[PDB]
Amino acid sequence: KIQDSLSSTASALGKLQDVVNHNAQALNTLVKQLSSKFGAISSVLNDI
Amino acid sequence: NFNGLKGTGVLTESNKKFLPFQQFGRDIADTTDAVRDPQTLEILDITPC
Amino acid sequence: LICAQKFKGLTVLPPLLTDEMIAQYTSALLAGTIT
C-alpha cells in the first residue's frame, strides 16, 4: 500500500522539489539581473 | 557587426526560423544570439566561445 | 535548454558520488540490516 500513496498524489515530494526550484529561481534572477541598466546610460557595455 | 550590433563570438549557420519582418535574435538570458545578414539573406547564429 | 543557456559564466559541477555508487551504499545497508 505504500507505493500507491507516492504514485497517486503530487504533493508527496515537495520537500525536494522546493530545493531545485529555489536554485533555478536564484540562477534565473541572477542571469536576468544584468539586463537592468542600473541607472547607467545603457545596459550593453560597448555602446557606452 | 550588423547595422549597429557590436560584439564578438563564433558565428555559424542559423537553421532556426525567422519571420520575414524579424531580424534580431534573443534568448531566455535576454542577450543577442542570432542575426540575419542584410547583404546575403541567410541567418547567422552567434554562438559563444 | 536553460542549463545550456547558463553558459554566461555559470557552471554546475557534477557531484563526486554518482547515482550507482549511492545505490550500492543503499544496497549494502539493506543487505546488512536484514541479515
Add this chain to the structure above:
Amino acid sequence: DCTMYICGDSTECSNLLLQYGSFCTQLKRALTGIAVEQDKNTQEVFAQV
C-alpha cells in the same frame, strides 16, 4: 512596501526606481517565506495532538 518606503508619493522618483529591476520582488519573496515559516513553527510545536 516596494516604493512607499523609499520615495513614496513621488512620481518621477517612482519612474526612476522601476528601472533598477526586481529588487523589491525578491525582498517581498524573502519576507513572505519568513512569515510562512513563522506560522509553520507554531504549527510544528503545538499541533502534536
